[PDB]
Amino acid sequence: AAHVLITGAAGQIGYILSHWIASGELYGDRQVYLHLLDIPPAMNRLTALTMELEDCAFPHLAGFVATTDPKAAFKDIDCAFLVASMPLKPGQVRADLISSNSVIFKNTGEYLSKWAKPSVKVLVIGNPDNTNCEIAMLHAKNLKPENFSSLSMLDQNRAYYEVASKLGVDVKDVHDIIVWGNHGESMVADLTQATFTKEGKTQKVVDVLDHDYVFDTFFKKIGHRAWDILEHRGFTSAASPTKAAIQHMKAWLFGTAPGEVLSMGIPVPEGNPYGIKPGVVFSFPCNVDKEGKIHVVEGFKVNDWLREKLDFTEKDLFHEKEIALNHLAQL
Amino acid sequence: AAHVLITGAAGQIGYILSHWIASGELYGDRQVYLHLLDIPPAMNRLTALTMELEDCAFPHLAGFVATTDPKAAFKDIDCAFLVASMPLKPGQVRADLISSNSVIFKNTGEYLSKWAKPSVKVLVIGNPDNTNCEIAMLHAKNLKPENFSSLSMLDQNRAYYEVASKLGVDVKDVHDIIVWGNHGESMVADLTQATFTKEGKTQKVVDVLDHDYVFDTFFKKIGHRAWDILEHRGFTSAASPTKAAIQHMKAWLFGTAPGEVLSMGIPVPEGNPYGIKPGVVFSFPCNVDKEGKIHVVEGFKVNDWLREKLDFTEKDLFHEKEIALNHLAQL
Ligand SMILES: NC(=O)C1=CN([C@@H]2O[C@H](COP(=O)(O)OP(=O)(O)OC[C@H]3O[C@@H](n4cnc5c(N)ncnc54)[C@H](O)[C@@H]3O)[C@@H](O)[C@H]2O)C=CC1
Ligand SMILES: NC(=O)C1=CN([C@@H]2O[C@H](COP(=O)(O)OP(=O)(O)OC[C@H]3O[C@@H](n4cnc5c(N)ncnc54)[C@H](O)[C@@H]3O)[C@@H](O)[C@H]2O)C=CC1
Numbered sequence: 285a286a287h288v289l290i291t292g293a294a295g296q297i298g299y300i301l302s303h304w305i306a307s308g309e310l311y312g313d314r315q316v317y318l319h320l321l322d323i324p325p326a327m328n329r330l331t332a333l334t335m336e337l338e339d340c341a342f343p344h345l346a347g348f349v350a351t352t353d354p355k356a357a358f359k360d361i362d363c364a365f366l367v368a369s370m371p372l373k374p375g376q377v378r379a380d381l382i383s384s385n386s387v388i389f390k391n392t393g394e395y396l397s398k399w400a401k402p403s404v405k406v407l408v409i410g411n412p413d414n415t416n417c418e419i420a421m422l423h424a425k426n427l428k429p430e431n432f433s434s435l436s437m438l439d440q441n442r443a444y445y446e447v448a449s450k451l452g453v454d455v456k457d458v459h460d461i462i463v464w465g466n467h468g469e470s471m472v473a474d475l476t477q478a479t480f481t482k483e484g485k486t487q488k489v490v491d492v493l494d495h496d497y498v499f500d501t502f503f504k505k506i507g508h509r510a511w512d513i514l515e516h517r518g519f520t521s522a523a524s525p526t527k528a529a530i531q532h533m534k535a536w537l538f539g540t541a542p543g544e545v546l547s548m549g550i551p552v553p554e555g556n557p558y559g560i561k562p563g564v565v566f567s568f569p570c571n572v573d574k575e576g577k578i579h580v581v582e583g584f585k586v587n588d589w590l591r592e593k594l595d596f597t598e599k600d601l602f603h604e605k606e607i608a609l610n611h612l613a614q615l
Numbered sequence: 616a617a618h619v620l621i622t623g624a625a626g627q628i629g630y631i632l633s634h635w636i637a638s639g640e641l642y643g644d645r646q647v648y649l650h651l652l653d654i655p656p657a658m659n660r661l662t663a664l665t666m667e668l669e670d671c672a673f674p675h676l677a678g679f680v681a682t683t684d685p686k687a688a689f690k691d692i693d694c695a696f697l698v699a700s701m702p703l704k705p706g707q708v709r710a711d712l713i714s715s716n717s718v719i720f721k722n723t724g725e726y727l728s729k730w731a732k733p734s735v736k737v738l739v740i741g742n743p744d745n746t747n748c749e750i751a752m753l754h755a756k757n758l759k760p761e762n763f764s765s766l767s768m769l770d771q772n773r774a775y776y777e778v779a780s781k782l783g784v785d786v787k788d789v790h791d792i793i794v795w796g797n798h799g800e801s802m803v804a805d806l807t808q809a810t811f812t813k814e815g816k817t818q819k820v821v822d823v824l825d826h827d828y829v830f831d832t833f834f835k836k837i838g839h840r841a842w843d844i845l846e847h848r849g850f851t852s853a854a855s856p857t858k859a860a861i862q863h864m865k866a867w868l869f870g871t872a873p874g875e876v877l878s879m880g881i882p883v884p885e886g887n888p889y890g891i892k893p894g895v896v897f898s899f900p901c902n903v904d905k906e907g908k909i910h911v912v913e914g915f916k917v918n919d920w921l922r923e924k925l926d927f928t929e930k931d932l933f934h935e936k937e938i939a940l941n942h943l944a945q946l
Contacts, residue, residue, distance in 0.1 A: 300631060303854040309638070332847035339840070339855040341772040341779075341786045441672040448672075455672045509670070516663035523634040524670040 285346065286311050289361040289400075291392065292368030292410060293320035293350070294329040296522040301365060301529065306337055308344035310530055310537075315346035321357035321368070322350075354391070358399035363537070365529060366392060366420065369410040372520060378411040378468050378510075382608045389416040390612055393423030402426065405576070407533050408434040408565075409525060414466050414549050415604045417565040419612070421551055433536065433578065434549030436471075436567040437528035438521065439463040442509050443473050446502065450493060451480050458489075462569045462584070463506070463547040465597030466604070471567075472593040473506035477584050499589065539574040545581050546570050557582050560594065564601040616677065617642050620692040620731075622723065623699030623741060624651035624681070625660040627853040632696060632860065637668055639675035641861055641868075646677035652688035652699070653681075685722070689730035694868070696860060697723060697751065700741040703851060709742040709799050709841075713939045720747040721943055724754030733757065736907070738864050739765040739896075740856060745797050745880050746935045748896040750943070752882055764867065764909065765880030767802075767898040768859035769852065770794040773840050774804050777833065781824060782811050789820075793900045793915070794837070794878040796928030797935070802898075803924040804837035808915050830920065870905040876912050877901050888913050891925065895932040 288305060292298050298320070305316055318337070322330045334350045351357050358364075370384040389410070396406060404427065408417035417434040424431070440463050448455045458480045464472040475498050478489035490498055513521045535546055548570040552562045557580070560566050569581040586594070619636060623629050629651070636647055649668070653661045665681045682688050689695075701715040720741070727737060735758065739748035748765040755762070771794050779786045789811045795803040806829050809820035821829055844852045866877055879901040883893045888911070891897050900912040917925070 299854060300634075303631075303858065304635070307640070307858070328847050329849070332844055332849075335840075335844050335847060336852055336855040338776045339769065339773045339844070339852065340858045341775045342858075343785070343787050438670065442670045444672045445669045454674070456674050509666075513663055513666050513670070516659050516666060518660070518663075521667055521670065523630060524667040527634065527638070527671045527673075 285317070286314055287317045287319060287361045289319040289321065289357055289364035291321045291357070291364070291366050294322040294326040294333055295367060295369070296519065297367045297409065297526055298322070299333055300523055300526045301367065302333060302337060303340065304526060304530060306340065306342040306345040308342070310534055311344070315344055317346045318348040319357045319361055320348060320350040321354070322352065324352050327352065354395045355399055358395045361400045361404055363405040363533060364396070364400065364407065365533070366406060366408045366416065367410050368392070372411070379604055381411050382415065382604065383611055385410060385412070385416060386419055386608045386611050387615055389419040390423050393420035396420065396431075397424035397426040400427070404431055405533065405536055406432045407529060407536070408432065408549075409529055412468060412604055412608075414468070414565045414567070414601060415608050417549060418551070418605055419608060421565070429551035430577070432551060432565070433532070434467060434565050434567075435525065435529050435532055436463050436467045436547040436549045437532045438525045439467060439471055439473065439506060440547040441524070441528055443506050446505065447475065447478065447480075447489060450497070451489070453480055453482055457481055459543060460545055460569070460584070462545065463567055464590075464594055465567050466601050467549060467567065468597075468600065468604075469507060470597040470600040471507050472590070472597050473503050474590055474593075475502065476587060476590055535572050536578065537576055539576065540571045544571060548578060550578055550580075553580060556580050558584070558586060558594070560598055564598070564605055566598065566601060616648070617645055618648045618650060618692045620650040620652065620688055620695035622652045622688070622695070622697050625653040625657040625664055626698060626700070627850065628698045628740065628857055629653070630664055631854055631857045632698065633664060633668060634671065635857060635861060637671065637673040637676040639673070641865055642675070646675055648677045649679040650688045650692055651679060651681040652685070653683065655683050658683065685726045686730055689726045692731045692735055694736040694864060695727070695731065695738065696864070697737060697739045697747065698741050699723070703742070710935055712742050713746065713935065714942055716741060716743070716747060717750055717939045717942050718946055720750040721754050724751035727751065727762075728755035728757040731758070735762055736864065736867055737763045738860060738867070739763065739880075740860055743799060743935055743939075745799070745896045745898070745932060746939050748880060749882070749936055750939060752896070760882035761908070763882060763896070764863070765798060765896050765898075766856065766860050766863055767794050767798045767878040767880045768863045769856045770798060770802055770804065770837060771878040772855070772859055774837050777836065778806065778809065778811075778820060781828070782820070784811055784813055788812055790874060791876055791900070791915070793876065794898055795921075795925055796898050797932050798880060798898065799928075799931065799935075800838060801928040801931040802838050803921070803928050804834050805921055805924075806833065807918060807921055866903050867909065868907055870907065871902045875902060879909060881909055881911075884911060887911050889915070889917060889925070891929055895929070895936055897929065897932060
């Protein structure tokens with residue numbers, strides 16, 4: 285009954301994402317109808333995808349449609365995973381995709397506004413996803429900022445596992461790790477809020493791990509992680525962001541758990557308590573109520589170190605916006 | 616607590632299989648410890664795999680070990696997914712991999728016998744999997760035939776979806792479709808047993824779909840399916856067999872549901888009711904009791920058509936065994 289869209293479905297992420305969702309991991313007992321969008325030169329792998337979906341005999345898959353037509357893909361969808369993208373060339377960073385992906389998400393915003401449900405929940409994955417989310421949201425007349433978000437939970441999950449290994453505890457035993465701002469080079473892996481509990485006793489991460497590790501070694505490691513996977517894999521990540529994206533969407537759809545804080549790129553809400561200026565999509569510490577509305581988690585402290593990092597990634601986001609939107613105007 | 620082995624983990628199937636299992640889809644609430652085996656020239660992607668597993672922050676993943684050392688991979692494992700294989704060249708069929716994969720599974724059988732638990736459940740995926748399963752089982756002194764099985768459920772799931780589309784019902788509404796014998800060119804997609812129910816009324820498939828479709832069009836389609844995916848994907852299937860393999864193993868571990876029949880390649884049991892001779896691994900209609908023991912489902916009818924098909928694929932299996940084991944002897 286639930287209609288889920290996946291753009292760039294024929295790609296590496298779309299391949300796994302479609303199967304995992306069809307398995308019933310997103311909507312549980314409720315069936316899913318997959319809208320699979322891609323482009324004609326990828327029509328082969330797109331068909332290859334559907335055939336394998338068919339070959340799973342998923343009882344949670346009510347049906348699907350694989351197309352290159354926007355309308356067929358976006359019509360009356362309940363949520364969307366925007367994974368569409370051109371190839372990231374060797375040696376490039378996420379921001380280098382602005383020139384080739386900006387138009388895609390400009391059009392996507394229009395498609396969403398034109399055909400998707402007003403309650404559509406759009407999760408942007410394709411890089412630069414914070415920016416691409418800004419593009420789509422801007423060019424969606426009939427939709428609001430609350431309909432859009434970008435994926436930063438891969439960064440948080442990276443941070444969670446890393447910190448967990450150094451503290452000698454499980455991931456579930458750590459709390460309030462946050463990745464602020466852009467899912468890019470300037471991402472801010474923040475541990476100044478973080479705590480962990482072991483055998484009844486709670487400790488602050490900064491009081492247990494040395495300064496040099498927390499603010500340099502760790503900070504660098506999380507930012508560079510995506511390229512470390514690329515070095516060993518020969519391609520950027522795929523299975524891990526798929527997991528983060530399903531985790532992200534599921535929380536967005538049905539709400540978060542007690543004490544759960546998720547790094548979610550959202551259009552900067554006016555009156556946010558962390559001094560970030562509106563105009564971009566910014567990763568905040570977020571929760572989601574049982575009616576599916578994201579809320580920035582209040583109460584976290586911003587010392588001089590974090591303030592500077594937030595300013596840097598904020599400046600970075602507004603810069604990407606300048607370059608991206610200017611490219612569209614001339615385009 | 617449950618230790619799961621995956622050979623050829625760095626490959627396409629091992630990539631998805633590892634993540635999906637780590638998600639908790641195999642052992643549910645019980646944690647999993649992944650033994651990830653591959654070869655040094657694939658050490659890069661093997662590390663790339665672990666990094667992404669780490670980057671998921673799976674709460675069901677207790678830990679893992681990625682190695683090229685047999686002992687570290689096979690020690691005290693509870694079950695194994697044998698996916699290890701050399702590349703399948705263009706234009707080849709599954710049986711063409713005998714020359715390059717036979718030794719792998721000869722050694723694997725020895726590793727299993729030497730280090731794995733006596734209760735280990737070994738699922739063979741790497742092609743030719745029926746044969747490769749025969750190789751491993753033969754060269755495992757301390758283990759029994761009941762410890763080994765090969766994957767044919769991808770064929771059944773293919774058959775189920777196909778038949779479902781033509782009957783205008785869901786997959787869950789169809790029953791007793793079977794794929795007998797070899798997971799190869801000679802595979803027998805049998806619908807002579809099949810039925811389906813719609814709105815209280817049950818019908819036999821052969822009484823609803825025309826003869827020409829059932830015994831020619833359908834029979835050919837399921838056999839050729841693997842190469843049809845290859846045509847469109849550029850590689851053989853990966854996500855769909857991963858699903859079938861997890862489905863297969865889960866049923867093998869915790870038993871099947873009422874009326875559920877699964878095509879499972881097992882060492883031909885002496886005294887099977889369908890006249891198949893011992894000495895090979897043969898796909899039978901199977902169920903599994905709540906203590907995890909596979910049983911060939913009795914009661915199915917074998918008309919002249921099926922008998923001939925069974926003889927052909929049986930002959931095919933004994934032929935593959937001749938070629939494979941002879942290659943090992945000279946090797
Ligand atoms: N947010 C995150 O944490 C992560 C994001 N990514 C990003 O995800 C994106 C895709 O990753 P992969 O699946 O590995 O790449 P891929 O190249 O395998 O897939 C991209 C797909 O988008 C399609 N596409 C291109 N233009 C399109 C258009 N106008 N409309 C519809 N579809 C179109 C292509 O045909 C292709 O199938 C990349 O931009 C990458 O940077 C990758 C890893 C993690
Ligand atoms: N049963 C079924 O329904 C299906 C079976 N397959 C079979 O699965 C096998 C693998 O498929 P893919 O993952 O796509 O292939 P792949 O080539 O991506 O992966 C095979 C992996 O096995 C590894 N390997 C090779 N020799 C080894 C050894 N001695 N020990 C440990 N690892 C070794 C390789 O390094 C490689 O990473 C193939 O033989 C293919 O025919 C494929 C599709 C469906």
